[PDB]
Structure 1
């Protein structure tokens, strides 16, 4: 038999209403592992570059990670993949909670949607029984609201529902998919779902999910739980609480937000407020947070409880974790109470809480500069808060000016013209970045911003510390029990790294050290996204319970395939390279791989050129960022190299 994976996918043609269960090729598991990797294989060989994001031939894939549904702590992620309407590159998007384990218990690893339904429908899965249901009665309803109505309809209180809100139905380019306290948030995956006329995917599963080596697997799981206990008794010394332990950023538990409010830019990634965090602010936001927070709650099979139910007076309850706590507050120069209220609305509409606040702040800078007129904003209230609420509603309905803003800052400015493009100053590959505008070029971060296929900095960093300790003795204490490094050299790099002097950035770590660090950090993210493992226990925090040394053991005990540390590094390199190839085939080149012009005050063009040159070399790519025929062949990706040649992307010899 197969283990850990169920070995089956659902193929759904929404145009025809046909549904088919199909066995998967076990060879694909050995090569590409699962989750993101096998999504990338499917997209490569079924979605050629002439396919547009809202064409019926675009695929929307829901994948459960390889080890989802097994007893591994926190292994519960869904990976949604499609071609993004905003970036026109691959979009993959991760969702925690309970949905991917339920799909596994129902018997499936993926659902693959093609075509478009003429009428709004939802898909209903209960073990072997799969059917398309009319959803016209749900038109416009919020994503959580929709889940609750369906569960009552079907009499399935234990079913897990992934749904879009009105923003997804109206194809907003940053519409999300929502499931309880979890969100596939970014790249427009909710827009593609809405385009296909798909309101929700409802699943219930009550079958067994088997692992290959039972005692060895549960053994590894217990070792993880012991490490979690110990790690939480030993936060990283001198690191802020939101980042000192395990989990997603622990923003729902911590009230102190000095680091965020004083180092991140307010407005349209525009304004540093150096001394924002006063006594009055601290006490006022703590009062808001204490009243609003109902309970800290976990995803499936995890003790970390990063998320929270949030209850604002007069508003339905919703669920929140991590940075959207602050993004609306900050984009609108407001307070935490405003943040939590508008986030309720935006969560039900199903909007990305990273891009949406910046699109609205971008808007008001245009209105401000006069590039947009007051006549483009019919009935625009006086109050600033009320203006954000107003504009939110115009956007999710693609109404008038909202119709342009619904396309994101890149497309909206391009459409608007009149120097509007100057104010879309925070994009990479057409995708909004974190609102961070720092002083000194950071050579590690430079590489991650340029090359990251998620195009989001919080989803490629983590395993190497963000900053050096001032004192050698702190560095010695840190590297002491740092078992997660692939190689001793990572300890030595951190030991020499200093905040100031000849061993400080941008000149140290060296170019070769920076490439190695970025490669290791990224690799861990790709491994998480194939297995379904929450990055909260792996690739995101310092010193995680899951790492490159025990992951191969989880894969071998769980899935019953051969795995060791080298084979795993190579598998991660393989589908990370395949994701790169897919974007190359869609037109991406070195030219696209540059951070915003104003991202650092101090730039070093010769050093930046040498970093990207060396990093491409490490990856085994062209100096145009294309994977070479040699490295493709070595990875078992010869078919990619053959197609590159045939398409003129690579030159034969």
Structure 2
């Protein structure tokens, strides 16, 4: 008997219209857990480097985490994997809400899509019943609009729907996949979906989902719920509110936007406004938000209610969470009202809220400098806010200049020329970064920007404090009950760490300390993305209810396989280097692992070199960022090593 996982996947060939259920190999679960882990295995030996993102041989995988569909609080994430049309590397993207559990209740762990459909279609899953439906009447509809129409047609009010908007249909490189209050946002997975002629994936499930050790599993859940209560009564002392509690960044709730609006960079990740947050601005935004926020709502089986339904006057309701609230506003140097209105359009279109506003702010910088002319923008309105609405429509339609801008800042600059490449100053591996330009080099964040396979900084940080406490008493109090740490040495590091003086950044924590910290933080994320656990209750916040010590208990009692702290650490390492191996085979080298040139104002070449050098060694990779034969064999990735030698990626 299989437990926690269903043991089955759906293989769908959109070219032939064939649908097949296939049993999975339980050994793969022991090696790569599930979710992102088992996705990586599938992509590795079925998507060779000669495969292009927009070719039929590219795969689009929808995966439910191993423990999705179990009573585990907040365990509900879908993991979408493919090859990115923007970065040309692997792209995994996480989506919360209610979709992944429904898939489990339907009886499947994954859906793997290959080939292309000549006509716009959608997939309809209802337990054992699976079929491909025509979706031509849905052409151009928004992603939310599409879900409602479909559920009426099928007469399935409790069906879960993941859809693309027009942007996906037109293969915009930063097109997303939307589901109610959830989004697979980054990497262009929406573009691959549209390229395959897939408008939506509809699922209804009503089967039972079993766990191996019933009494022990529910006990661990109660333990988590109790910790969540305690944590909400005891937030992290002396720290700004948005860092003090559990969940995704609680941007939809209260807090004064002083740090955010005065540290983030406005426009094309350009301007820093030191004294922006005035009393007039604070009340104006507070008033806009009180009027627009309808309700704080949760993902499946979670009490944290990070998301919020947003209702602007004369517009359809949509759902927003986290930093999407700020990005459109800041990119356009405008107010919160404008941001909430344009993000509504962008959500229905299905656009990544990180890349899209930077692309538009990028375009207007070129128009300002003269690299782009007014000839390129026919019918350009005069008002600033109106211009963003104008450009947004050009992009999702790939109309004129929109066709170039739809490729993202990197490829757009490369096509535009005339020194437009200088203005694409916020990319790593051709992927737009969070609009943050700090002053002093952060050794911990330097490593994360460089090596993170998600290529997004907010999805690799978490477990270690971003900043040190001034007083020692504050540090002593914090580490006292810091049970989540793998080793007692992490406490001692944070005790020594100081904001100013000899024990401050970039020289402290030491190179070796920084390598251990980044390794821990990254590990927790990869475990979450395999198990389907929301990072809001695990890898992202300080002192989470899920950690390296109780996680193996969940896996063992849930899935019914042997698991301990050490075996879990190794498992996490196994598919994390497998993902690394996939990107290596697609041409990634040490050269691509650099942050933007202007990312810090204080750089230290010799220190940065030693950081990356030491990190590679800790990871078990060589000096070019490639996993060595030795460490591959040790992880059970011998077949990886052989192919590297055969491809001349490693010397025999």
Same fold (TM over 0.5): yes
Unaligned runs of 5+ in 1: none
Name the CA distance, whole Å, in 2 between partners of 1:61 and 1:436.
32
Q: Deviations over 1:230-268 (max 9, x none)?
A: 001111112221221000000000241111100110000
Q: 1:596 Cα deviation (Å)?
A: 0.1
Name the CA distance, whole Å, in 2 between partners of 1:392 and 1:255.
30
Q: Is the 8 A contact 2:241 2:255 kept in 1?
A: no
Q: Deviations over 1:562-609 (max 9, x none)?
A: 000000000000000000000000000000000000000000000000
Q: What's the TM-score once normalised by structure 2's chain length?
A: 1.00
Name the CA distance, whole Å, in 1 between partners of 2:432 and 2:236.
30
Q: 1:286 Cα deviation (Å)?
A: 0.2
Q: Is the 8 A contact 2:247 2:535 kept in 1?
A: yes
Q: Deviations over 1:463-488 (max 9, x none)?
A: 00000000000000000000000000
Q: What's the TM-score once normalised by structure 1's chain length?
A: 1.00
Name the CA distance, whole Å, in 2 between partners of 1:613 and 1:332.
39
Name the CA distance, whole Å, in 1 between partners of 2:345 and 2:434.
22
Name the CA distance, whole Å, in 2 between partners of 1:273 and 1:478.
32
Name the CA distance, whole Å, in 2 between partners of 1:451 and 1:319.
32
Name the CA distance, whole Å, in 1 between partners of 2:444 and 2:242.
22
Q: Is the 8 A contact 1:255 1:285 kept in 2?
A: no
Name the CA distance, whole Å, in 2 between partners of 1:487 and 1:274.
39
Q: Is the 8 A contact 1:255 1:289 kept in 2?
A: no
Q: Deviations over 1:542-562 (max 9, x none)?
A: 000000000000000000000
Name the CA distance, whole Å, in 1 between partners of 2:560 and 2:404.
51
| Local SS of the residue matching 1:46 | coil
Match in the other structure for 1:596:
596
| Local SS of the residue matching 2:575 | helix
| Local SS of the residue matching 2:526 | helix
| Local SS of the residue matching 1:82 | strand
Name the CA distance, whole Å, in 2 between partners of 1:377 and 1:620.
50
Shifted more, 237-246 versus 172-181: the winner is: 237-246
| Local SS of the residue matching 1:269 | coil
| Local SS of the residue matching 1:484 | coil
Q: Is the 8 A contact 1:255 1:286 kept in 2?
A: no
Name the CA distance, whole Å, in 1 between partners of 2:213 and 2:341.
48
Q: 1:291 Cα deviation (Å)?
A: 0.2
Q: Is the 8 A contact 2:242 2:255 kept in 1?
A: no
Name the CA distance, whole Å, in 2 between partners of 1:592 and 1:490.
30
Name the CA distance, whole Å, in 2 between partners of 1:254 and 1:263.
18
Q: Is the 8 A contact 1:442 1:505 kept in 2?
A: yes
Name the CA distance, whole Å, in 2 between partners of 1:254 and 1:621.
44
Name the CA distance, whole Å, in 1 between partners of 2:560 and 2:254.
41
Name the CA distance, whole Å, in 2 between partners of 1:56 and 1:239.
50
| Local SS of the residue matching 1:353 | coil
Q: Is the 8 A contact 2:293 2:310 kept in 1?
A: yes
Name the CA distance, whole Å, in 2 between partners of 1:264 and 1:205.
42
Name the CA distance, whole Å, in 2 between partners of 1:651 and 1:31.
26
Q: Deviations over 1:177-223 (max 9, x none)?
A: 00000000000000000000000000000000000000000000000
Matches within 5 A, 1:260-279: 260-279=260-279
Name the CA distance, whole Å, in 2 between partners of 1:239 and 1:181.
28
Q: Is the 8 A contact 1:144 1:178 kept in 2?
A: yes
Q: Deviations over 1:473-517 (max 9, x none)?
A: 000000000000000000000000000000000000000000000
Question: Runs of 4 or more off by more than 3 Å in structure 1?
Answer: none
Name the CA distance, whole Å, in 1 between partners of 2:278 and 2:515.
39
1:437 aligns with 2:437: yes
Shifted more, 235-244 versus 382-391: the winner is: 235-244
Q: Is the 8 A contact 1:247 1:306 kept in 2?
A: yes
Name the CA distance, whole Å, in 2 between partners of 1:239 and 1:405.
40
Q: Is the 8 A contact 2:126 2:204 kept in 1?
A: yes
Name the CA distance, whole Å, in 2 between partners of 1:55 and 1:239.
49
Q: Deviations over 1:81-104 (max 9, x none)?
A: 000000000000000000000000
| Local SS of the residue matching 1:174 | coil
Match in the other structure for 1:511:
511
Match in the other structure for 1:120:
120
Name the CA distance, whole Å, in 2 between partners of 1:577 and 1:299.
30
Name the CA distance, whole Å, in 1 between partners of 2:275 and 2:479.
33
Unaligned runs of 5+ in 2: none
Q: Is the 8 A contact 1:237 1:244 kept in 2?
A: yes
Name the CA distance, whole Å, in 1 between partners of 2:237 and 2:99.
36
Q: Deviations over 1:276-318 (max 9, x none)?
A: 1111111000000000000000000000000000000000000
Q: Deviations over 1:594-633 (max 9, x none)?
A: 0000000000000000000000000000100000000000
Q: Deviations over 1:25-76 (max 9, x none)?
A: 0000000000000000000000000000000000000000000000000000
CA RMSD of aligned residues (A): 0.3
Q: Deviations over 1:429-448 (max 9, x none)?
A: 00000111111000000000
Name the CA distance, whole Å, in 2 between partners of 1:587 and 1:69.
37
Match in the other structure for 1:454:
454
1:144 aligns with 2:144: yes
Name the CA distance, whole Å, in 2 between partners of 1:435 and 1:462.
18
| Local SS of the residue matching 2:45 | helix
Q: Is the 8 A contact 2:331 2:361 kept in 1?
A: yes
Name the CA distance, whole Å, in 1 between partners of 2:207 and 2:437.
50
Name the CA distance, whole Å, in 2 between partners of 1:316 and 1:114.
34
Name the CA distance, whole Å, in 2 between partners of 1:381 and 1:244.
43
Name the CA distance, whole Å, in 2 between partners of 1:275 and 1:545.
37
